[PDB]
Design an enzyme around this catalytic site. Structure first.
Site, mmCIF file in Angstrom:
data_model
loop_
_atom_site.group_PDB
_atom_site.id
_atom_site.type_symbol
_atom_site.label_atom_id
_atom_site.label_comp_id
_atom_site.label_asym_id
_atom_site.label_seq_id
_atom_site.Cartn_x
_atom_site.Cartn_y
_atom_site.Cartn_z
ATOM 1 N N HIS A 1 0.897 -1.306 0.196
ATOM 2 C CA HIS A 1 0.004 -0.061 -0.003
ATOM 3 C C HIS A 1 0.746 1.463 0.145
ATOM 4 C CE1 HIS A 1 -2.996 -2.910 1.584
ATOM 5 N NE2 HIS A 1 -3.656 -2.324 0.667
ATOM 6 N N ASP B 1 -5.548 5.437 -0.853
ATOM 7 C CA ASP B 1 -4.858 4.692 0.099
ATOM 8 C C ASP B 1 -3.702 5.501 0.685
ATOM 9 O OD1 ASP B 1 -5.986 2.118 0.578
ATOM 10 O OD2 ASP B 1 -4.769 1.209 -1.153
HETATM 11 C C1 LIG Z 1 -7.262 -14.650 1.608
HETATM 12 O O1 LIG Z 1 -6.768 -13.722 0.675
HETATM 13 C C2 LIG Z 1 -5.465 -13.075 1.104
HETATM 14 C C3 LIG Z 1 -5.224 -13.345 2.327
HETATM 15 C C4 LIG Z 1 -3.805 -13.095 2.818
HETATM 16 C C5 LIG Z 1 -2.964 -12.282 1.896
HETATM 17 C C6 LIG Z 1 -3.510 -11.985 0.565
HETATM 18 C C7 LIG Z 1 -4.620 -12.446 0.387
HETATM 19 C C8 LIG Z 1 -5.327 -12.167 -1.053
HETATM 20 O O2 LIG Z 1 -4.025 -11.533 -1.792
HETATM 21 C C9 LIG Z 1 -4.461 -10.001 -1.853
HETATM 22 C C10 LIG Z 1 -5.217 -9.263 -1.344
HETATM 23 C C11 LIG Z 1 -5.704 -7.982 -1.361
HETATM 24 C C12 LIG Z 1 -6.602 -7.509 -0.398
HETATM 25 N N1 LIG Z 1 -7.022 -8.208 0.515
HETATM 26 N N2 LIG Z 1 -8.130 -7.949 1.503
HETATM 27 C C13 LIG Z 1 -8.798 -8.774 2.346
HETATM 28 C C14 LIG Z 1 -9.452 -9.902 1.448
HETATM 29 C C15 LIG Z 1 -10.286 -10.925 2.026
HETATM 30 N N3 LIG Z 1 -9.498 -11.437 3.204
HETATM 31 C C16 LIG Z 1 -9.625 -12.688 3.511
HETATM 32 N N4 LIG Z 1 -9.318 -13.273 4.790
HETATM 33 C C17 LIG Z 1 -9.072 -14.185 4.961
HETATM 34 N N5 LIG Z 1 -9.404 -15.322 4.276
HETATM 35 C C18 LIG Z 1 -9.908 -15.037 2.773
HETATM 36 C C19 LIG Z 1 -10.634 -15.918 1.449
HETATM 37 C C20 LIG Z 1 -10.614 -15.055 0.703
HETATM 38 S S1 LIG Z 1 -10.559 -13.478 0.878
HETATM 39 C C21 LIG Z 1 -10.048 -13.708 2.473
HETATM 40 C C22 LIG Z 1 -8.885 -10.208 4.114
HETATM 41 C C23 LIG Z 1 -7.789 -9.515 3.150
HETATM 42 C C24 LIG Z 1 -8.037 -6.396 1.679
HETATM 43 O O3 LIG Z 1 -8.686 -5.979 2.587
HETATM 44 C C25 LIG Z 1 -7.157 -5.397 0.825
HETATM 45 C C26 LIG Z 1 -7.626 -3.914 0.807
HETATM 46 C C27 LIG Z 1 -8.610 -3.667 -0.166
HETATM 47 C C28 LIG Z 1 -8.475 -4.428 -1.566
HETATM 48 C C29 LIG Z 1 -7.553 -5.440 -1.515
HETATM 49 C C30 LIG Z 1 -7.178 -6.072 -0.471
HETATM 50 C C31 LIG Z 1 -5.177 -7.570 -2.308
HETATM 51 C C32 LIG Z 1 -4.181 -8.244 -3.386
HETATM 52 C C33 LIG Z 1 -4.008 -9.478 -3.031
HETATM 53 O O4 LIG Z 1 -3.128 -10.276 -3.917
HETATM 54 C C34 LIG Z 1 -2.691 -9.694 -4.877
HETATM 55 MG MG LIG Z 2 -7.650 0.652 0.648
HETATM 56 ZN ZN LIG Z 3 -6.153 -0.128 -2.603
#
Ligand SMILES: COc1ccccc1COc1cc(C2=NN(C3CCN(c4ncnc5ccsc45)CC3)C(=O)[C@@H]3CC=CC[C@@H]23)ccc1OC
Ligand SMILES: [Mg+2]
Ligand SMILES: [Zn+2]
Length: 329
Positions: free
Chosen positions: A78, A119
């Site tokens: 970010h 961001d």
């Molecule tokens: C599960 O997905 C991840 C978990 C850890 C690290 C990375 C990822 C996916 O890779 C990217 C995530 C992002 C962004 N992530 N998030 C949230 C997405 C939903 N999330 C989850 N937590 C636990 N299990 C799952 C299963 C499906 S989603 C999920 C929490 C993290 C954000 O909040 C970021 C902020 C806004 C937009 C992008 C978001 C971005 C890029 C990734 O890989 C390139």
């Molecule tokens: Mg954001």
């Molecule tokens: Zn963003």
């Protein structure tokens, strides 16, 4: 009165500014770590936004440099490169044939300015992190869309720095409308809004009207702003839709930031957050989950809205998804 050779090599990468898959990390290196400023400047000139909004060019540069310096260079994901990427991806999405001549210049400025600030001053940890650590930001915003509220306040507050008021020639009506759209867009970047945003986008696709040329008809603020919100959110979640050389860099960086939230999550209350340890947390399954549950249902629904304009992007998303799957041993 002519550019240096580095400036030239940079100018030539920037000829890709209208393409999905721009070499944004290359741009960052060639610009001396100014991708957000040079990409924003290029988009503003290309869309004629300086003349339309009577924005003095030195004020635009001063704001953009100031804005970019309030992204943390010590945060792996970010940072200003992500900001630049989201701006540029919004820029391409706005040019989709299905939306041609749909949006006014003020709406376009709102979507791009929103992308640029979305961001800013991100500390590299999550809302839930900030809330659980009793951090000043969480307290300031009474725990509600903590980061997103902060991103907006900083992006707007920076306009008050010396020769930074890029909106100084807009009328009061213009600025009120612009500010409201910007706020509505950035607040929609909070992932906790994803499901409702996606539901409204699905509803829209079902009830989809068009005009003569087959471009979407959006005749109320609600629908207009919904589309812009989902557009920036698409851009925010566009990494897996990019060629894989790009996509993997983004993954690395998101993982760094996330693992690093661990090293602090060990001490600060809280057990950890799922799929965020290299002590039982596969990167590749995370990416497949991310795509299956979040990115693909969004981008597929976006793709229906603007059909057939998003096919290539959706194809790449599907390939990248297979690639990450096939690496799961
Ligand atoms: C599960 O997905 C991840 C978990 C850890 C690290 C990375 C990822 C996916 O890779 C990217 C995530 C992002 C962004 N992530 N998030 C949230 C997405 C939903 N999330 C989850 N937590 C636990 N299990 C799952 C299963 C499906 S989603 C999920 C929490 C993290 C954000 O909040 C970021 C902020 C806004 C937009 C992008 C978001 C971005 C890029 C990734 O890989 C390139
Ligand atoms: Mg954001
Ligand atoms: Zn963003």
């Amino acid at each position: 009165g002519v550019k240096t050779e580095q400036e030239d090599v940079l100018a030539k990468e920037l000829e890709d500014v209208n393409k999905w898959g721009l070499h944004v990390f290359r741009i960052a290196e060639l610009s001396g770590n100014r991708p957000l400023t040079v990409i924003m400047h290029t988009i503003f000139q290309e869309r004629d936004l300086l003349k339309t909004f009577k924005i003095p060019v030195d004020t635009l540069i001063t704001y953009l440099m100031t804005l970019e310096d309030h992204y943390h260079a010590d945060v792996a994901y970010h940072n200003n490169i992500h900001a630049a990427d989201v701006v540029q991806s919004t820029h391409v999405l706005l040019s989709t044939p299905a939306l041609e001549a749909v949006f006014t210049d003020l709406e376009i400025l709102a979507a791009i300015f929103a992308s640029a600030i979305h961001d800013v001053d991100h500390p590299g940890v999550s809302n839930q992190f900030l809330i659980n650590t009793n951090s000043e930001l969480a307290l300031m915003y009474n725990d509600s869309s903590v980061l997103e509220n902060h991103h907006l306040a900083v992006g707007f507050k920076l306009l008050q720095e010396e020769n930074c008021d890029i909106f100084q020639n807009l009328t009061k009506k213009q600025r009120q409308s612009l500010r409201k759209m910007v706020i509505d867009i950035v607040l929609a970047t909070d992932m906790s809004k994803h499901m409702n945003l996606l539901a409204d986008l699905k509803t829209m696709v079902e009830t989809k009207k068009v005009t003569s040329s087959g471009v979407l008809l959006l005749d109320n603020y609600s629908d207009r702003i919904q589309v812009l919100q989902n557009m920036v959110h698409c851009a925010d979640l566009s990494n897996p839709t990019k060629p894989l050389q790009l996509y993997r860099q983004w993954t690395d960086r998101i993982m760094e930031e996330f693992f690093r939230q661990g090293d602090r999550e060990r001490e600060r209350g809280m057990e950890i957050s799922p799929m965020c340890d290299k002590h039982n947390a596969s990167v590749e399954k995370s990416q497949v989950g991310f795509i299956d549950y979040i990115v693909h249902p969004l981008w597929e629904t976006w793709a229906d809205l603007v059909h057939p304009d998003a096919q290539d992007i959706l194809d790449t998303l599907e390939d990248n998804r297979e690639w990450y799957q096939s690496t799961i041993p």
